[PDB]
Amino acid sequence: ADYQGKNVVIIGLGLTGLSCVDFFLARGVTPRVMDTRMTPPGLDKLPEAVERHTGSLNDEWLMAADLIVASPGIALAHPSLSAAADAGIEIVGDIELFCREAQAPIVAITGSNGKSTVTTLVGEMAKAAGVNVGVGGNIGLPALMLLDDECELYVLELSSFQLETTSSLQAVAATILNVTEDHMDRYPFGLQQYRAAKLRIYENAKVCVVNADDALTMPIRGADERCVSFGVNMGDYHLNHQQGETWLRVKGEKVLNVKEMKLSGQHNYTNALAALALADAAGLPRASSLKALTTFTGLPHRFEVVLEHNGVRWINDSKATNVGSTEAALNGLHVDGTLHLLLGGDGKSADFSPLARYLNGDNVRLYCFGRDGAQLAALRPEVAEQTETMEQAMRLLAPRVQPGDMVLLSPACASLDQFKNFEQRGNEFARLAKELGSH
Numbered sequence: 001a002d003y004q005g006k007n008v009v010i011i012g013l014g015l016t017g018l019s020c021v022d023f024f025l026a027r028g029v030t031p032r033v034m035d036t037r038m039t040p041p042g043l044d045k046l047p048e049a050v051e052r053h054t055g056s057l058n059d060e061w062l063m064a065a066d067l068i069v070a071s072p073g074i075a076l077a078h079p080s081l082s083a084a085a086d087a088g089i090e091i092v093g094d095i096e097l098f099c100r101e102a103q104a105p106i107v108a109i110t111g112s113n114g115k116s117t118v119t120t121l122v123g124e125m126a127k128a129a130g131v132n133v134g135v136g137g138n139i140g141l142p143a144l145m146l147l148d149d150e151c152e153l154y155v156l157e158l159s160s161f162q163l164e165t166t167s168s169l170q171a172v173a174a175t176i177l178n179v180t181e182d183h184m185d186r187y188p189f190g191l192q193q194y195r196a197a198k199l200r201i202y203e204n205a206k207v208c209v210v211n212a213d214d215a216l217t218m219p220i221r222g223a224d225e226r227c228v229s230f231g232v233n234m235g236d237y238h239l240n241h242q243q244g245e246t247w248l249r250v251k252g253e254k255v256l257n258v259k260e261m262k263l264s265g266q267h268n269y270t271n272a273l274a275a276l277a278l279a280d281a282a283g284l285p286r287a288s289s290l291k292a293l294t295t296f297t298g299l300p301h302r303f304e305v306v307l308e309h310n311g312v313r314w315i316n317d318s319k320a321t322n323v324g325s326t327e328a329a330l331n332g333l334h335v336d337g338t339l340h341l342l343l344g345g346d347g348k349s350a351d352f353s354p355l356a357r358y359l360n361g362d363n364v365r366l367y368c369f370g371r372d373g374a375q376l377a378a379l380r381p382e383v384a385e386q387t388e389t390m391e392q393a394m395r396l397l398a399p400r401v402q403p404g405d406m407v408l409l410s411p412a413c414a415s416l417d418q419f420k421n422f423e424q425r426g427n428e429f430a431r432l433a434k435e436l437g438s439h
């Protein structure tokens with residue numbers, strides 16, 4: 001694309017907004033920046049040469065623009081943006097800018113859960129093959145910071161929001177791993193509108209990889225041209241259970257005994273299948289992809305044991321920012337004693353009801369905090385306590401912890417009411433676990 005001479009407005013600063021500023025400056029185009037926040041992240045890094053407007057959107061700038069680059073963190077349906085759209089002004093995001101320039105194939109991954117594990121796993125499979133790979137998007141480097149002539153493959157985690165502003169993605173392999181209720185605060189036409197944003201990922205993809213166990217991951221149409229599938233008991237890529245052992249299979253052929261993996265648990269096994277299906281479709285050698293599966297240890301904040309001491313496991317699953325992710329932590333969970341489960345934050349208008357089925361018996365205590373702490377306590381009030389903050393909840397539960405217990409932060413909610421991001425929430429949990437979980 002050629003931006004020379006265009007009046008470009010970037011909405012949203014932070015690292016990804018900065019990447020957009022830098023992208024245009026390097027092409028001899030000076031954009032203007034606006035952000036509804038008064039002191040947005042990264043403001044001190046914005047050169048004085050770049051005009052900016054903070055604390056609100058500026059409709060004089062937006063209606064004057066030739067191109068608007070919208071952060072995924074701003075609603076596309078914001079009345080200032082719908083006005084610019086109605087007037088015919090082009091609106092894109094950073095992923096669109098990236099797709100227009102990229103000179104290597106792109107593997108594109110979205111889903112309500114699993115998407116960072118699967119992105120990182122395919123990145124590791126590529127490295128194991130000696131491929132020069134750029135991994136990022138919605139995690140790691142903003143995609144524009146990955147752009148490099150020497151890159152041979154890009155692996156991008158994409159959110160529903162990024163996909164809404166992307167039109168030129170033609171992925172060598174794309175997947176929606178699953179769709180479960182999330183981001184209802186941003187999708188006023190509910191589950192089908194959220195799904196529709198994700199289904200954009202398959203448009204012009206060479207191979208589509210779908211979840212055979214989740215119908216919502218399947219395009220609304222495909223004909224003589226089907227997607228590759230992964231699943232538990234069915235799929236092109238699927239699991240084979242043998243006594244107590246599990247295998248990854250591809251069309252009936254065993255390819256890996258999961259004992260070789262460092263990741264455990266069924267949903268990691270289906271993540272491994274999805275990653276293998278994407279790697280295969282991207283042309284990576286099967287054997288090096290399987291080697292990567294054996295060496296991968298998981299991400300921080302993903303069901304991460306931050307302390308096992310004095311007979312108690314303290315588990316940081318702060319990456320669980322929706323109900324489906326906490327379900328995946330609870331379903332089949334083995335605890336010898338009491339489970340002390342921390343839930344709380346901004347639930348984004350989610351129905352928390354699906355969690356209730358995991359919370360029966362005499363061996364569960366709930367400690368519920370943040371914006372939606374009361375709604376969470378209401379799942380089972382007789383075993384619940386509510387506090388304002390996670391630290392209060394930790395200090396309340398710790399004296400009650402006995403050998404055999406588990407303390408699990410798997411909060412089912414965004415952290416953004418009280419924290420910068422779920423990493424900060426996990427790091428704080430870890431520090432407090434280490435304080436409270438030894439003498």
Ligand SMILES: O=C(O)CC[C@@H](NC(=O)c1cccc(CNc2ccc(/C=C3\SC(=O)NC3=O)cc2)c1)C(=O)O
Pocket residue numbers: 011012013014034035036037071072073074159161321413414415416420421422423
């Ligand atoms: O870390 C957590 O705990 C919660 C993370 C949680 N993330 C989002 O909902 C989300 C959705 C879209 C984008 C992002 C990251 N990028 C952002 C960029 C700009 C903003 C805010 C802006 S831009 C502006 O102009 N005015 C704004 O307020 C917020 C996030 C985060 C979630 O999944 O619940």
Ligand SMILES: O=S([O-])[O-]
Pocket residue numbers: 013014015016017
């Ligand atoms: O720039 S981002 O990562 O908010």
Ligand SMILES: [Cl-]
Pocket residue numbers: 036037038039
């Ligand atoms: Cl503000």
Ligand SMILES: [Cl-]
Pocket residue numbers: 253254255
């Ligand atoms: Cl084999």
Ligand SMILES: [Cl-]
Pocket residue numbers: 308309310311
């Ligand atoms: Cl110990």
Ligand SMILES: [Cl-]
Pocket residue numbers: 360361362363
């Ligand atoms: Cl029980």
